[PDB]
Amino acid sequence: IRVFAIPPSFASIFLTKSTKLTCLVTDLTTYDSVTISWTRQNGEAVKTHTNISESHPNATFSAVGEASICEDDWNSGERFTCTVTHTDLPSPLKQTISRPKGVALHRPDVYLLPPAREQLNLRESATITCLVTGFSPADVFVQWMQRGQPLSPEKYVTSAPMPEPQAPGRYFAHSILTVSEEEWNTGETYTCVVAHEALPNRVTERTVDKSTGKPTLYNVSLVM
Amino acid sequence: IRVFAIPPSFASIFLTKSTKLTCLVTDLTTYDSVTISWTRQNGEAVKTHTNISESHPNATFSAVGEASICEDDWNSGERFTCTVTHTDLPSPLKQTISRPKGVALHRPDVYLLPPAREQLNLRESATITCLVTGFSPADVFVQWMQRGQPLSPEKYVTSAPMPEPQAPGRYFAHSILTVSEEEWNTGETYTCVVAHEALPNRVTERTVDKSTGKPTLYNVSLVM
Amino acid sequence: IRVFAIPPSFASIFLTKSTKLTCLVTDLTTYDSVTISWTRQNGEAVKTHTNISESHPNATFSAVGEASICEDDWNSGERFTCTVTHTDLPSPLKQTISRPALHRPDVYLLPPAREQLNLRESATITCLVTGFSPADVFVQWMQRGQPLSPEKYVTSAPMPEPQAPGRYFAHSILTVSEEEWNTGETYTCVVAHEALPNRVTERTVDKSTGKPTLYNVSLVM
Ligand SMILES: *[C@@H]1O[C@H](CO)[C@@H](O)[C@H](O)[C@H]1NC(C)=O
Ligand SMILES: *[C@@H]1O[C@H](CO)[C@@H](O)[C@H](O)[C@H]1NC(C)=O
Ligand SMILES: *[C@@H]1O[C@H](CO)[C@@H](O)[C@H](O)[C@H]1NC(C)=O
Numbered sequence: 038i039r040v041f042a043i044p045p046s047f048a049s050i051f052l053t054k055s056t057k058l059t060c061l062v063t064d065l066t067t068y069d070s071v072t073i074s075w076t077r078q079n080g081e082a083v084k085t086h087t088n089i090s091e092s093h094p095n096a097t098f099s100a101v102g103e104a105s106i107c108e109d110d111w112n113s114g115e116r117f118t119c120t121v122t123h124t125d126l127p128s129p130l131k132q133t134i135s136r137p138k139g140v141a142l143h144r145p146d147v148y149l150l151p152p153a154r155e156q157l158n159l160r161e162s163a164t165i166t167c168l169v170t171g172f173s174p175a176d177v178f179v180q181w182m183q184r185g186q187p188l189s190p191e192k193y194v195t196s197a198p199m200p201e202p203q204a205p206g207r208y209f210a211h212s213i214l215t216v217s218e219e220e221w222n223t224g225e226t227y228t229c230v231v232a233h234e235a236l237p238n239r240v241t242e243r244t245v246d247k248s249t250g251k252p253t254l255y256n257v258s259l260v261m
Numbered sequence: 262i263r264v265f266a267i268p269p270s271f272a273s274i275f276l277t278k279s280t281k282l283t284c285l286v287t288d289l290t291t292y293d294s295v296t297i298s299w300t301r302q303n304g305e306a307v308k309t310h311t312n313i314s315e316s317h318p319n320a321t322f323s324a325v326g327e328a329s330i331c332e333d334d335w336n337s338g339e340r341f342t343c344t345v346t347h348t349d350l351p352s353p354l355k356q357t358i359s360r361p362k363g364v365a366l367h368r369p370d371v372y373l374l375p376p377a378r379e380q381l382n383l384r385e386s387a388t389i390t391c392l393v394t395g396f397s398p399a400d401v402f403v404q405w406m407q408r409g410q411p412l413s414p415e416k417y418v419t420s421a422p423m424p425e426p427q428a429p430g431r432y433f434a435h436s437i438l439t440v441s442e443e444e445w446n447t448g449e450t451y452t453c454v455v456a457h458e459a460l461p462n463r464v465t466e467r468t469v470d471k472s473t474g475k476p477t478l479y480n481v482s483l484v485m
Numbered sequence: 486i487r488v489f490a491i492p493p494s495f496a497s498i499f500l501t502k503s504t505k506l507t508c509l510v511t512d513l514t515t516y517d518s519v520t521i522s523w524t525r526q527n528g529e530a531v532k533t534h535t536n537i538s539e540s541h542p543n544a545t546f547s548a549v550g551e552a553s554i555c556e557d558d559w560n561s562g563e564r565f566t567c568t569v570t571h572t573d574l575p576s577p578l579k580q581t582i583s584r585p586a587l588h589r590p591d592v593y594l595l596p597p598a599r600e601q602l603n604l605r606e607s608a609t610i611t612c613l614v615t616g617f618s619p620a621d622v623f624v625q626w627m628q629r630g631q632p633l634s635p636e637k638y639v640t641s642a643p644m645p646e647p648q649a650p651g652r653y654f655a656h657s658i659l660t661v662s663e664e665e666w667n668t669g670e671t672y673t674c675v676v677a678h679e680a681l682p683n684r685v686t687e688r689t690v691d692k693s694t695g696k697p698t699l700y701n702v703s704l705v706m
Contacts, residue, residue: 055333107331109279144409148601150611153593155688162648166595166611166656185368187461196641196656203607203660211641211656213613215648230462237411238454240462250695253472255479257702483700 039063042119042132045111048178051232051239056111059103060119060132066097068124073102076118076131082106114138137174142235143207145172149229149243151250152221163221165245167212167229170201175208178232183225188214221247263287264345266356269335272402275456275463280332284343284356285314289322293348297326300342300355301334338362361398366459367431369396373453373467375474376445384442389469391453394425394433402456403436408449412438448472487512488580490550490567493559496623499677504559508567510546520570523552526563526581559584586651587680590617594674594688596695597666608666610690612674614655615646619679624657627673627687633659667692 041061050056060073071089075082084104092098102121110117116133123129148170152163169177175198181188195212214227228244266284274280284297299307310326317323326343335341338359346353372394376387391403403419405412420435438451448471456464490508498504506523513519517540523531537548550567558565566579593615597608612624620643626633638659646652659672675687 105333107333109329109332146601148598148609150595150598153595153613156591156593159591164593164613164615166613168598168609168611168658170609182461185461191647194644194647194654196644199639199641201660202637202639209658213654213656232462238406238464238466240464240466242466253475253477254704255481255702256477257481257483257700259697259699260482260484481702 038065038125040121040130040132042134044134044136046178047176047232047234050108050111051178056106056108057103058106058117058119058134059101060121061099061101062121062123062130063099064093064095064097065099065123066125067092068098070124071098071100072123073100073121075102075104076120077110078116078118078133080118082117111136140174141206143171143173144235145169145177145231145233145241147229147231147241147243149245151245152216157218157221160218163216163218165214165216165227167214167231167243168209169211169231170209171204171207172209172233172235173207174234175210176234177210179210179212180230181212181214181227182230183227224248262289262345262347262350262354264343264354264356266343266358268358268360271400271456271458274332274335275402280330280335281327282330282335282341282358283325283327284345284358285326286322286324286345286347289347290349291316291320291322295322295324295348296344296346297324298344299326299328299330300344302339336360364398365430367395367397367428368459369393369401369455369457369465371453371455371465371467373469375469381442381445386439387442387445389438389440389451389453391436391438391455391467392433393435393455393457395428395431396434396457396459397431398458399432400458401434403434404454405436405438406452406454416440445471486571486574486578488567488569488578490565490580490582492582492584495621495677495679498556498559499623504554504556506550506552506554506565506567508550510548510567510569512544513546513569513571514544514573515540515542515546516572519546519572521548521550522568522570523550524566524568524579525558526566528566528568586618588616588618588652589680589682590614590622590676590678590686592674592676592686592688594690596690602663602666605663608661608663610659610661610666610672610674612640612657612659612676614657614676616649616652617643617655617678617680618651618653620653620655622655622676622678624655625675625677626657626659627671627675629671637661 043059043061045056045058073086075084082104086100086102089100114135116135118131118133120129120131148168150166150168152165156163167179169179179195181193193212193214196210198208198210201207201209224246226244226246228242231241232239264284264286269280269282297310308328312325314323314325340357340359342355342357344353344355372392374390374392376389381387399422401422405417417436417438422432422434425431425433450468450470452466452468454464454466489511493504531552535551541547562583564581564583566581568577568579570577593613595611597610601608614622624640626638638657640657643653643655646654671689673687673689677685
C-alpha cells in the first residue's frame with residue numbers, strides 16, 4: 038500500500054495537448070468501492086477513475102486516477118490535491134504537487150547529424166542521431182516524422198536527459214532513428230522536431246537528406 | 262441590444278498561450294447597469310469580466326467582458342453563451358459562439374519565396390514573401406524570426422486569408438518581410454514560422470538565405 | 486531482511502584490471518557488531534574487508550565489503566555469497582551473485598555538424614555504440630594516445646535497440662572547442678566490450694576524414 042503523485046511531463050502534455058494530472062496508488066488490497074475523487078487548493082476539480090489496473094504479480098490490486106486540467110492552472114503553481122479513497126485505508130490520502138519554479142530557460146540547440154559513411158558501407162541499417170543540447174529544465178519531447186507524416190514510436194528511441202559536461206545548468210538529450218539504406222539513398226528529407234519551454238515557438242525543426250553533405254555550388258565526380 | 266461576441270482566434274490563442282473570449286455590447290445607453298455572464302451547457306460560473314470598456318464619446322455603449330476558459334473545452338465544440346441583460350431592454354440578449362464544426366482540416370503547405378532579381382537590382386529594399394496555401398479553416402497566425410528571435414510586429418505584414426481558386430474549401434495567406442538590400446547580401450538566414458490547427462505540431466518552419474535557390478553552377482567532371 | 490551486492494561490471498573490471506566485490510547491505514537495520522562474511526557457492530576463505538562505515542540512520546547498512554577476486558572466478562559463473570549473519574536473525578542469510586547472448590558492438594563516429602562549427606562556441610563529437618550484449622561498455626576518448634579527462638566526455642546508459650530487443654545501444658559525446666576541431670586532432674573514441682574478440686575497438690575521425698582525399702576542390706573569391 039503506497040500513494041504516488043506524478044507530475045505530468047511536458048512530453049506528456051505536448052503529445053495530447055492536455056495537462057493530465059495522474060495519481061497512482063500502488064499495491065492496494067482488492068476491495069470494493071474503488072473510488073478516486075479530485076480536489077485542489079480551491080476544490081473544484083471533478084473526474085473519476087478510468088481503467089484501473091488489474092492485480093500485480095505480487096498478489097494485490099491497484100488503481101489509477103487521471104483528470105483533465107488546463108495549461109494555465111499548471112503554469113500558475115497551484116498545488117493540485119489528488120485524493121484517493123478506499124476502504125482498506127482508514128483515512129483517505131491526498132497528494133499536492135505543482136511545477137518547480139525559478140529554473141532558468143535555455144534555448145535548445147538542435148543539430149542533426151547524418152549517418153556515418155562506414156555505417157552506410159555495411160548496407161544493413163543506417164542510424165540518424167538528433168542532438169538536443171543546451172536546454173533547461175531538461176524535459177523534452179523528441180519525435181520523428183517523414184515528409185510531414187509522423188513515424189511509429191517504436192522506430193526511434195529517445196535517451197534520457199543527462200548533464201552537459203561543459204555547462205552545469207544546461208542538460209542535453211539524445212534520440213536516434215534507424216533507417217534502411219534504400220530509403221536514405223533516395224532521400225525523404227528526414228526532419229527532427231523538438232518541443233521545449235525555452236523555444237519561443239515551442240517547436241523547432243531541423244532536416245537532413247543525402248544531398249546535405251554536398252555544398253551544391255560544385256558537382257565533382259570521379260569515374261574511372 | 263447588439264452584443265458582438267469575438268471568438269478567440271488561433272492568433273489570439275497562440276500569441277498569449279491562453280485562450281481569451283470577449284463578448285462586447287454595442288450601441289446602447291452610455292452608462293447604466295449591465296450584467297454580462299459567460300454560460301456553458303452546465304450553467305457554471307466563469308471568471309470575472311475584467312476591464313469593462315469606458316463609455317465612448319459618440320454615446321455608443323461598449324463593455325469588454327474577458328475571461329480565462331479551458332483550452333481543450335473550447336476545441337471540443339461545446340458552445341459558450343454570453344448572456345447580457347440591460348436596464349434599457351428587459352429581455353436579455355444571448356450570444357453563443359464556439360469553434361465551428363463540420364470543417365475539414367488540411368495541412369498547410371508553406372512556400373517561402375526569395376526576393377526578385379529586379380527588386381534586388383535597385384537595392385533600395387528586399388521583400389521576402391511567405392506563401393501559405395491549402396490550409397483550412399481560415400484562421401492562421403504568421404510571424405517572422407531572424408536568427409532565433411522574432412521580428413517586430415510593425416516590420417512584417419500578413420495578408421488576410423482568401424479562398425484558393427483551385428480548392429474551394431482551402432485558403433491561402435501571404436506575409437511579406439521588407440528588409441534592406443544589404444541585409445540580404447549578408448545571407449543572415451531569415452526564417453518564417455506559421456501557426457495552424459492542421460499541422461502535427463500546429464507549427465512548421467521554413468528558411469531562406471542567399472545560398473538557397475542557387476543551383477549547381479559547376480559540373481566539374483574529373484574522369485580518368 | 487535481504488542482502489544486496491554490486492556485481493562487477495566490465496567497465497569496473499577494465500578500470501581496475503581486476504574484479505572487485507562491493508556488498509552494500511540494504512533492507513537491514515543497522516545494529517552494533519553485525520557479522521558479514523564473503524564466501525563462494527562452497528565457501529572458502531577471503532581477504533579482509535576494508536573501509537567499513539558506522540551505523541547508518543537510513544535503515545540501510547551502508548558499509549562496503551571490499552574484496553578483489555580473480556577474473557576466471559567471475560566469468561566461470563560460479564556463485565558468490567555475501568553471507569550476513571545479522572544480530573536480529575540468528576539464521577545466516579546470503580545473496581548469490583554471478584554474471585547472467587553476446588553480440589559484437591559496432592562503433593561509428595559522427596563528425597560534428599557544420600551548424601555547430603559555424604557558431605564556433607563549441608564542437609561536439611558523438612560516439613555511437615550499437616549492437617552490444619550485455620549492457621556493459623566503457624566508452625573512453627583518446628587524443629593522440631593521451632587519455633582525456635573524464636569530465637570532458639559523458640556516456641549515456643545503454644538502452645535496448647529498437648531493431649532487436651537483444652541488442653543494446655550506447656551513445657557518448659565529447660565537448661570541445663571549434664579551434665580544437667578545425668586544427669588537426671585525432672580524437673579517437675575507444676570502446677571496450679566483452680563480446681569483442683579483441684575486447685577493444687576504436688575509430689578515428691579528422692577534419693579531412695569527410696573529404697575524399699582525392700580532389701581538394703576549393704572556392705576562392
Ligand atoms: C552531382 O554529382 C553526382 C555524383 O555522381 C551525380 O550523380 C549527380 O547527377 C550530379 N548532379 C547533377 C545535377 O548533375
Ligand atoms: C553532371 O555531370 C555528370 C557526369 O557524370 C552527368 O552525369 C550529369 O548529368 C551532369 N549534370 C548536369 C545537370 O549537367
Ligand atoms: C586543400 O589543402 C590545403 C592544404 O594546405 C588545406 O589547407 C585546405 O583546407 C584544403 N582545401 C579544403 C577545401 O579543405
